[PDB]
Amino acid sequence: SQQTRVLQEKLRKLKEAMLCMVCCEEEINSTFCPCGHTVCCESCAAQLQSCPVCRSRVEHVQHVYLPTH
Amino acid sequence: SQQTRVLQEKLRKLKEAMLCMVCCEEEINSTFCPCGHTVCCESCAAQLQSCPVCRSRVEHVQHVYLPTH
Ligand SMILES: [Zn+2]
Numbered sequence: 325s326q327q328t329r330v331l332q333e334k335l336r337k338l339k340e341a342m343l344c345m346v347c348c349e350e351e352i353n354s355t356f357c358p359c360g361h362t363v364c365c366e367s368c369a370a371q372l373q374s375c376p377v378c379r380s381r382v383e384h385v386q387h388v389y390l391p392t393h
Numbered sequence: 394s395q396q397t398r399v400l401q402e403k404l405r406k407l408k409e410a411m412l413c414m415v416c417c418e419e420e421i422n423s424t425f426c427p428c429g430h431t432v433c434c435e436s437c438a439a440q441l442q443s444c445p446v447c448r449s450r451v452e453h454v455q456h457v458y459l460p461t462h
Pocket residue numbers: 344345346347348349350364365366367368369
């Protein structure tokens with residue numbers, strides 16, 4: 325129905341919010357510490373020395389195990 | 394249709410996976426370090442001394458800013 329189409333779009337938007345903001349291909353699973361922005365996959369996070377959201381120094385990357393994975 | 398019901402269930406489960414595993418009311422926004430389990434809100438994470446998923450000693454709680462918040 326039309327409601328199936330509406331729900332597919334909502335699901336797509338929620339899944340896109342869970343994808344890395346740099347590569348757009350892999351799920352977010354890494355936090356830039358200490359700022360806390362959790363916006364990248366592990367491969368993109370390993371290549372950034374400054375946060376892409378707030379520009380703070382990345383002291384280290386913490387892997388996050390999320391229930392939505 | 395039955396497809397609409399399947400998608401509604403997927404959306405519900407994804408939304409439930411973003412809620413704190415202790416209070417079931419507030420969004421997850423905290424990571425237990427060093428293990429990385431990210432399953433609680435700030436208030437519930439604050440006094441836990443051991444991770445509720447893996448039993449590891451909690452050395453630090455890192456706040457996380459997720460795009461799904
Ligand atoms: Zn990436």
